[PDB]
Amino acid sequence: KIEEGKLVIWINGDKGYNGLAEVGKKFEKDTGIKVTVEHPDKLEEKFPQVAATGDGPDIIFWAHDRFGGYAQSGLLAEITPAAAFQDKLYPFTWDAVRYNGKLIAYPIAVEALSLIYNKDLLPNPPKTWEEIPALDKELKAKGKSALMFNLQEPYFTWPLIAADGGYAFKYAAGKYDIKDVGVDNAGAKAGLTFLVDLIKNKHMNADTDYSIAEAAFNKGETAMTINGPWAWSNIDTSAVNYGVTVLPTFKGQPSKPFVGVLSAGINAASPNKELAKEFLENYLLTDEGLEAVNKDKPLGAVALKSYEEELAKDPRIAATMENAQKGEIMPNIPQMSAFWYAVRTAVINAASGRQTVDAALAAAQTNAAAKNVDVEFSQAISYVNKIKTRFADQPDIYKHFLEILQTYQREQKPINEVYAQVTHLFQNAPDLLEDFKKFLP
Numbered sequence: 001k002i003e004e005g006k007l008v009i010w011i012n013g014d015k016g017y018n019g020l021a022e023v024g025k026k027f028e029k030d031t032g033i034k035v036t037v038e039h040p041d042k043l044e045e046k047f048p049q050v051a052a053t054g055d056g057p058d059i060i061f062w063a064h065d066r067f068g069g070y071a072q073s074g075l076l077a078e079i080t081p082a083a084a085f086q087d088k089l090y091p092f093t094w095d096a097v098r099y100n101g102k103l104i105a106y107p108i109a110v111e112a113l114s115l116i117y118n119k120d121l122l123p124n125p126p127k128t129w130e131e132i133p134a135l136d137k138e139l140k141a142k143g144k145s146a147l148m149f150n151l152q153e154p155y156f157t158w159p160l161i162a163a164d165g166g167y168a169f170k171y172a173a174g175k176y177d178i179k180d181v182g183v184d185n186a187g188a189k190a191g192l193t194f195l196v197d198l199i200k201n202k203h204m205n206a207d208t209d210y211s212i213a214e215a216a217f218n219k220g221e222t223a224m225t226i227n228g229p230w231a232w233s234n235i236d237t238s239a240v241n242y243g244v245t246v247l248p249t250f251k252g253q254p255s256k257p258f259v260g261v262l263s264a265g266i267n268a269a270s271p272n273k274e275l276a277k278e279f280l281e282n283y284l285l286t287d288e289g290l291e292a293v294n295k296d297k298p299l300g301a302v303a304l305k306s307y308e309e310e311l312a313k314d315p316r317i318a319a320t321m322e323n324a325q326k327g328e329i330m331p332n333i334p335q336m337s338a339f340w341y342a343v344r345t346a347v348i349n350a351a352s353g354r355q356t357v358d359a360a361l362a363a364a365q366t367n368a369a370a371k372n373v374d375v376e377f378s379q380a381i382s383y384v385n386k387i388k389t390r391f392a393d394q395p396d397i398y399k400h401f402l403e404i405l406q407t408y409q410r411e412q413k414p415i416n417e418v419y420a421q422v423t424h425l426f427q428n429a430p431d432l433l434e435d436f437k438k439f440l441p
């Protein structure tokens, strides 16, 4: 039910949506087309649900890592920029929004996490993660803390996890191997273990989130934080004098932040694709438009060459790009969301103590990696054997088992309803219910 003759835009609540709304108001005056900018929570999760039936915004803003999943699901229109417009943007940013040979979004800005530190508490920031524990002890004797940052989102903890060898998907010459995940190798384990020890030795608190960390840094309570360029404007208001620098090294190796490219995608079900392209190309992606958003919340290093050549003179931008060079630009493949969900659970479970690092990351490795088809078939054989162990007197049990799985596909049965059908059929014991979940998660 996307209405024709208007533009509805979704953008995350930490970006400069008020500045984006002003670009929209200039668009409305020139064209008569009302532009509405909304920032719903979890918009990156709501968009696949509403767009699939033809609803949702005309334009969705998010980092490029979500967009490949959207495109594979037929939710994004293909971008049709003339060659002259494409030359206005850096080629590596166009690469970030390319999926299966097609441009599926307009890139806006390059984002990378940096180390933000209080120059009146810490004139020289630490070069290594390893010295932070003793630095915290010295600062705790002066009524301060060393480091506070968002421990709830794996975006913020991944640079340390990846530093010694962790990775999301192995890049093998032009394709990401969705079967080669590096979430439970020795490097990822060493990085998450340093994180959990920081919490264990009371240098960080597992409950710290984005807002707790931002308030503590902007009040001068903690000497360091980890954040992106969108956070700089609130620090400008705070009276804290801060520097933006390269993240600390772990085991002598640089932290590797996942680099995001903020991108605007056009809903495939939108009846306003021409209006969306005009707004994005001729209003937002200009010096005038980006400055309007950038003055609300800084965007990072923008994709537009003309505006970025002036933004690159900021040492905070130069530090952002230095951290980007040491990190890796994110894959956009559809498997990214499962990777992020798996790592979020692992960090949270390990940080709180509910699981060891090794257990937490082994479960995340299985959740993020594609199935080993030879392994699962052997488990299917073991599962069949288990049925015969407990139901030797029910010769029709396999016929009814297959019927459930067939009807699942033929009639679009919800998965949890399939689960109830399995537990009722195997009414004797629920081990067959637990064993079944792996085959259909």
Ligand SMILES: OC[C@H]1O[C@H](O[C@H]2[C@H](O)[C@@H](O)[C@@H](O[C@H]3[C@H](O)[C@@H](O)[C@H](O)O[C@@H]3CO)O[C@@H]2CO)[C@H](O)[C@@H](O)[C@@H]1O
Binding pocket: 012, 014, 044, 045, 063, 064, 065, 066, 111, 152, 153, 154, 155, 156, 228, 230, 260, 337, 340, 341, 344
């Ligand atoms: O943790 C569960 C969430 O995992 C996924 O979110 C990813 C994003 O897809 C990824 O872009 C990055 O988000 C950051 C974003 O780039 C930045 O502009 C914003 O200001 O900060 C974000 C970090 O909070 O990292 C997160 C993972 O932390 C998934 O898409 C999302 O639905 C899950 O809820």
